[PDB]
RNA sequence: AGGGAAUCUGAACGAGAUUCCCACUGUCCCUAUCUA
RNA sequence: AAAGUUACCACAGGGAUAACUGGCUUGUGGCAGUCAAGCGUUCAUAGCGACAUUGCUCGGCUCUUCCUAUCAUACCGAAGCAGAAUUCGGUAAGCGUUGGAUUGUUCACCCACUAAUAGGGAACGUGAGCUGGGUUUAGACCGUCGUGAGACAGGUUAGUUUUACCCUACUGAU
RNA sequence: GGCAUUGCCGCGAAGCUACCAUCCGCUGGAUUAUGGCUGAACGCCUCUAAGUCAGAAUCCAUGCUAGAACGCGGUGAU
């Protein structure tokens, strides 16, 4: 059996990682950072609750 | 790679003195063989 | 040989030296396991079969025609609690297996009692000679 | 797979595009790679390479020289022979154990005057030097004169042994 | 031992000394032979010999 | 064994054979012992090496002996076919030399181990071991000629065709370069040269075809004018349960007289007299009727340029060789066209769907969008299946609103009565 | 009111011995837990 | 009359040493001849002579670590290597190297499974991690009775390193 | 309920636990054999001599574990 550090399998997995396999992670990251940006505005509204 | 075992260059005193006895043995043979 | 598609792990209930019943109408009533084909290898561990695994097994109580020759045997009933992917853990009443050639083709014409879901999935011709599945 | 499945393929499609370039450059590299192997190859592979390469030089000397010449025109741990009257023979050999493995019956004798070797059975052990005990035991150490059976067949009945059968396999003798 | 008993005169089992003592050997002798003119054909064949006794 | 022999372990040329067996005994056995050890370990060391080299040569020799087909025990066609292609006496001389050499090596090993249990020094023991393996080497050095022969026979028998003497066969004969190469070329898939000279073909080429649901094999032959190539053809005629298709060139071509074909046909007549002969033509016309004087012959005129008469010759050959309530069908199926694989204009299957969507094991098939519903807006089904300890499917029926309202009537019939106080 | 059947040994035997057949068990596969 | 001889030599006595890696060890035998690079004190006819070649022929249970001389797994080269399967060879020690019946002296092997069930070291590795079967009432000295041939339950004797609430490695902890 | 050298029996939480249960166990450079490029030595050639690309389960890293109690750092507290 091919090892975990078998050179050809590492290169085949690098063929994967430049396709769909990274793009889904690079969409998920944008959705996570979006909700992180959404988390500032809620807390800023609770700043303006006291500021009222 | 897995670098294999290296031979020593330390000649032990038993080796070194045994070398001298083997050398002098080769002399005594060569002096006899010279006569024939 | 013979097994269709992939094979997934279910618990091992039938080691080497276990007497299971015979389920087909070939002639044999029981079966004695001697070796398990396609098993792991530890130190001191016996080869243990499960449901739907081809073992090499001898007839102990049956027709003399089916004896004199050690032959492949696919286990159809386990009686040890294995797990299905649909939530439940299940087990049968007794250990039973059916005799076949190395190709996976059945000698008998019908299999009595329930046949396991996993065994009938992996072996097509067992499901061909099946009366009851599950 | 019919008969000549690659020869017909050559005779219809060719070898390669670069089959002649690869071959010619490889044969031109082999002049270097002989020397690149001779200065590498540590160990047993070096000794085997040196022996094969010495052989490949002497054979070439023979080709060139022949062309130039055709241009013009207690138990004993030594090997013994025991005669066929073994069953109750030792009168004077109380505890002189001679095992059956060490008994060689047919000496590999060569003829001097005609360079032919006849593998013949030993009849009698005559005169072993070093020990006159060994003459009576039948020991076949180097220098022993033995009697040779000429049943299979000018010939001399006696042969003097030349090898040390304790070391090598057989007994090797030369006729007198 | 039964088919021996009905095809011979006196059937005696031994396993003598100078056997292994651990091995499951029997040397059974069957002295005296009937030599019948009518031999039962279904008897001597191994298909009917090892026909197992029914349950209790 | 049966028809063909490709599966033979290779034959080393007796110098390399030594370099395999002797190197393996150097690598696989322990190699380092002091002179200062006990004599018992020195003995056991060299005994282990003599024996292991013994098993080495014997293993390689046994592979040769069991590997090659036992010539006089196989089959009468193959016994004689190998006898034509190879000097049968020398083929048995070579294998006899290997069978001799194996017994020799066995004798050597058994000798020197027995001689070895009496060694007194490491030197004596070493000299005896060197004596043993050197003696084995001398035996194998005497095998440089038969093993060189055995490699060539291994290579050439490995490429020989597999004829079946029990299937329906038909020999294809005639003078060398009549045009019978074009016949087997245009009857089956087998590449046989029609090169304009005498002995183009050098062996028995085989072509398989199927007619009347049966396996047939037509055997092309080099031709008869005696040679090893020529006698191969004649013994193929003699030993095969077959019919012979003798081909004639009634033309300027071939470079041989038709009268010589007549002379050869009537000369070789005895050994194909039992085979029910067919003759195909690819004072003067009267001497074709001289050929017709044979008990079992038929004459046919054909052209290889057209593909109908070549098939008709086959039809007559195979014919000679054999003697020797209403169903429900929906109109949506009847009106439907056939699936042409090389059509630019047809429906795309799921096979092409998964390729266009990318990959075999990566595409997930949508079970939805393929089932029939009243509204295709609710195609993407959720279906709860469980609500609070009790599964939905057990509660699920049509007219549950009317059935609920029946139970609502059964509410008010118990509401005013006074069960809830 | 633990079996059973043979055999070796001095027909049942005797906690004689051996072998087999049937039953049983953590001896083991493969250990896990509790108490003193 | 008895005498010569003894390495045919059998028993008692006196001498002389045995048994120290001086890099050990591995795969290709030996004897005789055929060539034959040279050297022989000149030099082939003072002789030695390599590779070839020709003659017939004490065992086994369990763990740790190491070696490669690798059985499998990884990548290669050669091979009539159509495909599959395989044979030889190279790099390669990263990781693997199974379960039962086996006791006239096992210094044998059976029958499967497995990708494969590779070979060795840790000088008395692993008998003060241990058992399964062998000496005969087995060491040494002295005596008594004895033709060549052995006994005597004579008589005197020796058989100390094993425990360390040492030492320190190793694990873990302040 | 006292008590039974835990008198005996059934079930059994918590805890502990089993391939008798379940989950999880990686990706970049440098190379070996080898295959090559340009190219000398040597007015051909030549994978190597100066250079140079690829290439093993190999190596070194990434990752994974401990943290030097006499290695260091930043930060809070008067």
3D structure, described in words:
The structure is cut from a larger assembly and holds chains A (52 residues), B (36 residues), C (134 residues), D (176 residues), E (56 residues) and F (421 residues). By secondary structure, chain A is mainly α. Chain A starts with 6 loop residues before the first helix and ends with a helix. Helices cover 81% and strands 0% of the residues of chain A. Chain B has 36 residues and is mainly α. Chain C has one domain: Ribosomal Protein L14. In chain C, 34% of the residues are buried. With 176 residues, chain D is α+β, with helices and mostly antiparallel strands. Chains in contact: C-E, D-F. At the D-F interface, loops of D face helix 4 and helix 5 of F. Chain D binds three RNA strands through helix 2, helix 3, strand 1, strand 2 and strand 5.
Task: Describe the secondary-structure layout.
The structure is cut from a larger assembly and holds chains A (52 residues), B (36 residues), C (134 residues), D (176 residues), E (56 residues) and F (421 residues).
Chain A: H1 7-17, H2 20-23, H3 25-51
Chain C: E1 14-15, E2 19-22, E3 30-36, E4 48-49, E5 54-58, E6 71-77, E7 82-83, E8 89-90, E9 96-99, E10 111-115, H1 117-122, H2 124-128, E11 130-133
Parallel strand pairs in C: 2-9, 10-11
Antiparallel strand pairs in C: 1-4, 2-3, 3-5, 5-6, 6-9, 7-8
Chain F: H1 16-27, H2 39-67, H3 76-85, H4 88-116, H5 122-141, H6 146-157, E1 168-174, H7 180-185, E2 206-210, E3 215-220, H8 228-239, E4 242-248, H9 258-268, E5 278-281, H10 286-289, E6 299-301, H11 309-323, H12 331-334, H13 350-356, E7 386-387, E8 390-391, H14 392-395, H15 400-415
Parallel strand pairs in F: 1-3, 1-4, 4-5, 5-6
Antiparallel strand pairs in F: 2-3, 7-8
Helix pairs in contact in F: 1-2, 2-4, 2-5, 3-8, 4-5, 4-6
The structure holds 3 RNA strands.
- Total of helices of chain A: 3
Number of helices of chain F: 15
Outline of chain F: flat
Main structural class of chain A: mainly alpha
Q: β content of chain F, as a range?
A: 5-15%
**Strand and helix order of chain A:** HHH
Shape of chain A: rod-shaped
What is the percentage of strand-forming residues of chain A? under 5%
**Order of neighbouring strands in the sheet with most strands of chain F:** 2-3-1-4-5-6
Sheet with the most strands of chain A?
A: none
For the biggest sheet of chain F, the summary is: 6 strands, mixed
Helix content of chain F: 40-55%
Largest protein-protein interface: D-F, 17 and 26 residues
Provide the gyration radius of chain A in Å: 21 Å
Count of strand segments of chain F: 8
Tell me the Rg of chain F in angstroms: 40 Å
The CA-CA distance between the termini of chain A, in Å, is: 68 Å
PDB class: ribosome
Keywords: Large Subunit Biogenesis Nucleolus, ribosome
Entry title: State D architectural model (Nsa1-TAP Flag-Ytm1) - Visualizing the assembly pathway of nucleolar pre-60S ribosomes
Chain A: UPF0642 protein YBL028C
């Amino acid at each position: 059996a091919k090892s975990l550090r078998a050179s050809s399998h590492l290169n085949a997995k690098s063929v994967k990682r430049r396709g769909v396999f990274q793009k889904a992670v690079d969409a998920r990251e944008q959705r996570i950072s979006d909700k992180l940006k959404e988390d500032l505005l809620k807390q800023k509204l609770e700043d303006l609750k006291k500021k009222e | 790679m897995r670098v294999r075992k290296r031979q020593s260059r330390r000649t032990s005193t038993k080796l070194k003195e045994g070398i001298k006895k083997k050398a002098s043995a080769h002399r005594k043979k060569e002096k006899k063989m010279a006569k024939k | 040989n013979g097994a269709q598609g992939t094979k997934f792990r279910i618990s091992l209930g039938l080691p080497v030296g276990a007497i299971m019943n015979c389920a087909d109408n070939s002639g044999a009533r029981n079966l004695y396991i001697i070796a398990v084909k396609g098993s792991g290898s530890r130190l001191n561990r016996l080869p243990a079969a499960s449901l739907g695994d081809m073992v090499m097994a001898t007839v102990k109580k049956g027709k003399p025609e089916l004896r004199k020759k050690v032959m492949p045997a696919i286990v159809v009933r386990q009686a040890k609690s294995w797990r299905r992917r649909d939530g439940v853990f299940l087990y049968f009443e007794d250990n039973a297996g059916v005799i076949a050639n190395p190709k996976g083709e059945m000698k008998g014409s019908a299999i009595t009692g329930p046949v396991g879901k996993e065994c009938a999935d992996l072996w097509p011709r067992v499901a061909s000679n099946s009366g009851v599945v599950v | 797979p019919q008969n000549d499945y690659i020869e017909r393929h050559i005779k219809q499609h060719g070898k390669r595009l670069d089959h002649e370039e690869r071959k010619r450059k490889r044969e031109a590299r082999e002049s270097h790679k002989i020397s690149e192997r001779a200065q590498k190859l540590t160990g047993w592979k070096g000794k085997q390479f040196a022996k094969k390469r010495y052989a490949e030089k002497v054979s070439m000397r023979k080709k060139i020289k022949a062309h130039e010449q055709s241009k013009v025109k207690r138990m004993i741990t030594k090997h013994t022979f025991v005669g066929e009257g073994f069953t109750r023979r030792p009168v004077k050999m109380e505890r002189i154990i001679r095992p059956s493995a060490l008994r060689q019956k047919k000496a590999n004798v060569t003829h001097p005057e005609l360079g032919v070797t006849v593998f013949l059975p030993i009849l009698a052990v005559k005169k072993n030097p070093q020990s006159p005990m060994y003459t009576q035991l039948g020991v076949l150490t180097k220098g022993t004169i033995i009697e040779v059976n000429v049943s299979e067949l000018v010939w001399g009945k006696y042969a003097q042994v030349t090898n040390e059968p304790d070391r090598d396999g057989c007994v090797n003798a030369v006729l007198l | 031992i039964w088919v021996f008993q009905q095809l011979f005169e006196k059937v005696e089992a031994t396993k003598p000394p100078a056997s292994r003592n651990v091995s499951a050997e029997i040397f059974v002798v069957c002295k005296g032979f009937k030599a019948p003119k009518r031999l039962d054909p279904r008897l001597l064949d191994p298909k009917e010999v090892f026909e197992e006794l029914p349950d209790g | 064994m049966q028809l063909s022999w490709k599966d033979i372990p290779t034959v080393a040329p007796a110098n390399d054979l030594l370099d395999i067996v002797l190197n393996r005994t150097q690598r696989k056995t322990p190699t380092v012992i002091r002179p200062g050890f006990k004599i018992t370990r020195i003995r056991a060391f060299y005994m282990r090496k003599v024996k292991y080299t013994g098993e080495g040569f014997v293993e390689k020799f046994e592979d040769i002996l069991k590997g090659f087909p036992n010539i006089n025990d196989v089959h009468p066609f193959h016994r004689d076919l190998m006898d034509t292609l190879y000097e049968k006496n020398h083929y048995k001389i070579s294998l006899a030399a290997i069978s001799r050499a194996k017994s020799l090596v066995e004798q050597v090993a058994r000798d020197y181990v027995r001689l070895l249990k009496f060694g007194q020094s490491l030197f004596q023991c070493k000299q005896l071991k060197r004596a043993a393996l050197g003696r084995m080497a001398t035996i194998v050095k005497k095998l440089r000629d038969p093993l060189a022969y055995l490699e060539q026979v291994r290579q050439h028998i490995g490429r020989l065709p597999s004829i079946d003497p029990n299937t329906r066969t038909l020999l294809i004969c005639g003078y060398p370069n009549v045009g019978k190469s074009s016949f087997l070329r245009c009857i089956t898939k087998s590449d046989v040269d029609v090169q304009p000279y005498a002995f183009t073909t050098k062996s028995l080429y085989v072509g398989h075809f199927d007619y009347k649901y049966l396996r047939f094999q037509a055997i092309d032959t080099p031709g008869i004018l005696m040679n090893n190539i020529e006698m191969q053809s004649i013994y193929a005629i003699a030993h095969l349960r077959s019919c012979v298709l003798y081909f004639m060139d009634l033309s300027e071509q071939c470079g041989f007289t038709i009268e010589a074909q007549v002379k050869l046909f009537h000369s070789i007549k005895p050994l194909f007299a039992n085979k029910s002969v067919m003759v195909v033509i690819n004072e003067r016309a009267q001497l074709l009727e001289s050929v017709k004087e044979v008990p079992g012959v038929e004459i046919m005129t054909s052209s290889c340029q057209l593909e109908e008469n070549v098939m008709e010759v086959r039809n007559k050959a195979c014919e000679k060789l054999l003697a020797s309530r209403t169903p429900f069908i929906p109109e949506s199926v009847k009106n439907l066209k056939k699936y042409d694989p090389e059509d630019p204009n047809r429906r795309k299957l799921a096979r092409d769907i998964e390729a266009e969507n990318g990959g075999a094991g990566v595409f997930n098939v949508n079970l939805k969008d393929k089932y029939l519903l009243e509204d295709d807006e609710w195609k993407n089904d959720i279906m709860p299946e469980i609500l609070d300890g009790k599964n939905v499917y057990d509660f699920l029926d049509p007219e549950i609103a009317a059935k609920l309202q029946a139970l609502e009537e059964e509410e008010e019939k118990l509401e005013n009565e006074g069960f809830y106080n």
